[PDB]
Swiss-Prot record, chains A, B, C, D:
Protein name (Swiss-Prot/TrEMBL): Glutarate 2-hydroxylase
Summary of the function given for this chain in its UniProt record: Acts as an alpha-ketoglutarate-dependent dioxygenase catalyzing hydroxylation of glutarate (GA) to L-2-hydroxyglutarate (L2HG). Functions in a L-lysine degradation pathway that proceeds via cadaverine, glutarate and L-2-hydroxyglutarate.
HAMAP family tied to this protein: glutarate_hydroxylase
Coiled coil: none
Catalysed reactions, as listed in the record: glutarate + 2-oxoglutarate + O2 = (S)-2-hydroxyglutarate + succinate + CO2
Taxonomic path: Bacteria, Pseudomonadati, Pseudomonadota, Gammaproteobacteria, Enterobacterales
Family, as annotated: Belongs to the glutarate hydroxylase family.
Biochemical pathway: Amino-acid degradation
Native organism: Escherichia coli (strain ATCC 8739 / DSM 1576 / NBRC 3972 / NCIMB 8545 / WDCM 00012 / Crooks)
Summary of subunit composition and partner proteins: Homotetramer.
CDD domains: CAS_like
Record text on cofactor binding: Binds 1 Fe(2+) ion per subunit.
Amino acid sequence: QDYSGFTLTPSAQSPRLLELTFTEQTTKQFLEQVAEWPVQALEYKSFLRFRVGKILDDLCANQLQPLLLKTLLNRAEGALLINAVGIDDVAQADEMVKLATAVAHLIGRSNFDAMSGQYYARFVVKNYLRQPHRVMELHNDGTYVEEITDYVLMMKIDEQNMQGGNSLLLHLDDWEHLDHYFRHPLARRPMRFAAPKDVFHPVFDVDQQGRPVMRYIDQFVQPKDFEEGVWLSELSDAIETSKGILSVPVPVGKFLLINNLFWLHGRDRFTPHPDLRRELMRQRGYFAYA
Amino acid sequence: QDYSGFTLTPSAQSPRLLELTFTEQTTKQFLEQVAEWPVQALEYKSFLRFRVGKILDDLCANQLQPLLLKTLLNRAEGALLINAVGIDDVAQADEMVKLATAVAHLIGRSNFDAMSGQYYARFVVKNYLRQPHRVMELHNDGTYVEEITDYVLMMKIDEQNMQGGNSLLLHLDDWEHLDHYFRHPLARRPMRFAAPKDVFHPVFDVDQQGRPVMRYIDQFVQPKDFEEGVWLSELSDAIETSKGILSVPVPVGKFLLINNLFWLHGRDRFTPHPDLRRELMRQRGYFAYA
Amino acid sequence: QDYSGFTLTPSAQSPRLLELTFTEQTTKQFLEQVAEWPVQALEYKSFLRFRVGKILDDLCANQLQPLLLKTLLNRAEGALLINAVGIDDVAQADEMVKLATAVAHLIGRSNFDAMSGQYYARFVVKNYLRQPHRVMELHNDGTYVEEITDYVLMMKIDEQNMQGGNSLLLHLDDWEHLDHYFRHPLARRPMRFAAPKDVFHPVFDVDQQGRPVMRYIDQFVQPKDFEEGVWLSELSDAIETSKGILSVPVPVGKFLLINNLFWLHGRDRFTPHPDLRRELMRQRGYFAYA
Amino acid sequence: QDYSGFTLTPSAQSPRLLELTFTEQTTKQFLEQVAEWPVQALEYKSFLRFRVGKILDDLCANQLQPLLLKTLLNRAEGALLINAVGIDDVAQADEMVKLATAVAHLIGRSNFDAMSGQYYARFVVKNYLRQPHRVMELHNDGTYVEEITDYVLMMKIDEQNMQGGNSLLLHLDDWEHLDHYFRHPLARRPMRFAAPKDVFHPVFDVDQQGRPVMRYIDQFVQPKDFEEGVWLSELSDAIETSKGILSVPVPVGKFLLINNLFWLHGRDRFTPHPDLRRELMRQRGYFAYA
Ligand SMILES: [Fe+2]
Ligand SMILES: [Fe+2]
Ligand SMILES: [Fe+2]
Ligand SMILES: [Fe+2]
């Protein structure tokens, strides 16, 4: 398939993860057509988040939106690494926020983020949970609020003096222990989840066709007793040692966009360096389509 | 396996349907040990329904109850035809009610039946829905009340001048159109069900492992529009013409006991005869096990 | 416009009331294709009401359903007189119920009727509210239940020795006093309505575009005081003396199908005759369309 | 004061009870102007109850309605005996229902009556609670339903071979034991009232100015214990032996209309006679005024 305005190819890590790259021409026209709205105008007026999405999609002859949706909702796939030729440097952070906003608002809506007070959040890492030699464990987002998070978007804004730190991904259908954990008696028992109002939901559920989906994070699940706590500790080990995990470099200017129901994500350890600098932007939300 | 007090063999119709026959000795001892409780005492005091179950199970060295449960809950099976050597005539109707009560109360509890005002009901057929030349369509029981019916028990009390009229059975896993109907967009949409307070639930759902189960009856489903109504009418035809349907003679003194979640049941047409007489007893309820 | 399977022409009474007549060929094929479902099967299985609708629509090359909907929802129209060549005698009552059922279930669903215990009701008139010399006052149906009745269907099944008795119709946009009553302070005040649980709603409301619609009947409105009661009594007189009222003979085998939000209906007086016989069928329900 | 269409004079029993008599001319014009509505039309269409009220009031140059309201709401009065010259015989029962309906619907609305299924009820007495030698104890109406009854209307339709049976009345401000019972600790304690859903309210309350009002009947009050029951039994005796009670003959064609908050009513004993005949009509409701 030859698409209008972008190309599409499988990643080096997995055929489940597709790489979508906007052509230089699409990128220039996009930036020109959204220059009248600074990032602040997107912050203030949520309708402009959808408008910039429409602008990008029209520049791709209305082929982008159905491709995004089909890829993210397809159980066999459900993940994209996305970039635009010519947006690849920390000095273009505003342009990166604009691009990611447009893509996200073609498939749904980005929820309010408590860490920033906006629909997206940016974080800066320089040199117990912020240990460089520790892996951030695989998890799903949104486990401690009532409404389901359908997607997670993570964009690399900057990277300096950085060895390691790849994003880690696990698709449930590549996880060799899924069948063992999904069939356990505890799998579909509602458990308490709390951040530091509590919600109750199981670790596993099923999609419309009956296939397993997952809502799990070690930090926010609150086992009520020994039985639950021992089972969860083993679950954790069975995720973290999986042979199906992907290790994905996210270069500056690219972002991962993944279906949060059947992908888990995390982050690899990295080398400490006095002049290390890593900057990320995230957006999480719900799918909505006509 | 040689069981104590009963034998067990697959039916002529399907390996999914097992035939359990209590030996003559078990039958005589059972009747002796429950003779102090007439059927009326079972009607009045629901604990005696469980007591007579315990009596039958003890006579089978406590092998009956786990066999019943495992067979009814096993997706590959989930149906029994049950009888007792020496109970085979309409004059022993009381003994038949006692036997069926004991078996049912080993796996759960029989619900109140509006047609009789008791935990079981008996009906007598002699010569538009009571047409002999019409098939009673395949359906699940309990579709129009809030709590799920897990089992259906149908016992033949009497049969005279009767050609045809077999019980019809369809296990979902023998139904060739299951995949087509379970994946349709309407399959898991809650629909209104009413008898002649309304409840809302879908036609299809899933068991704990994600496999399809069904709660359907043509008469009590109330489609809200053309879309729903046309789809249900086709569903009906796809059930009634299935090649997977079993045709099971139920002789006097035997009863079918089936898992109402993944078996549908109905009844075949029969020949009119001036001196026809058919008498049935039913019991429906929920599973409960330690 | 030449339609496939039916013709369509304005009535002698008003361009707002269109007459739709199924051709003889459509009628014969329709009756052949629904002969396997007697009226009782429609009573028992509500999905078959939609199926017979689909059968009629397919015979009209799928032109009937969009024509019905557009006519009934069009403010300038909203009423049909409908018949089928060859169905015109009391001996074909079953065929008349089948036809009217098919048409109704193409535009929505007919609600349960307390007078019959079915989705339609038939009534037989032979020789204070059943006085022949009295007009049945113009009204809307469904005024004393919570959910809105969108349509009313009234079919003449039989008529013998009958002088007068036409159906009376008033479209709000032909009512010369609408503006006076819709602007009164009482027009949009919720009032109590009860049949002989009470509901509360105003006599007037507005459609989506802001135009007046009405939910009124003299018998079931319960004014709470002198002010309300005097105003309603004048409203009544202003309806009953309107110059915009239509007088429509409904011959045997025809039925009126009207939008109950902006049409009121009633019935004219008639001559007593020892051997008078009039038989009607009604169906009332809600619109539903994809 | 000379009123238009009626005269007004204090009763022989008490200055608190005024007698209002419609003149012969007002009566004839009233009957002429309401002849198009039989009593059945009033039953069917509650707005006509208010319309006939308007007709009577207009014939009294709009002086009747404010006189009715002021008299019934005035604490010093609150009771009327009402009649119309020329309506005085059982053969004019329909005219009596029309008159009483008009008066009542000028001051409020008559509630549904369970004994008749209509807004008024008629009863016929001929020769333990229906003993002739027993007094019907003084009480307030409406004590066992949630909403307050503000007025009681009792009209004599017929009387034959009748000695005694006067209506008994007690205004709270003529009751010598009021102060003793109103100040008791139990006076304002909510008690259970039930007819043969229960409501809870005290025996005494206060009007807007802080003056005592009463909601009491011996038959429907349900004391919860010895304390309540003994106090109520003494209350009863203190009402029934009061020196303030009025004894009012109600002749055929007249009706009492009383404020049910500060008047109690009952009925005196009477002589048995083989050919006794007494016929009453009642209406009870709430006040409503602009
Ligand atoms: Fe995360
Ligand atoms: Fe059944
Ligand atoms: Fe009507
Ligand atoms: Fe009373």
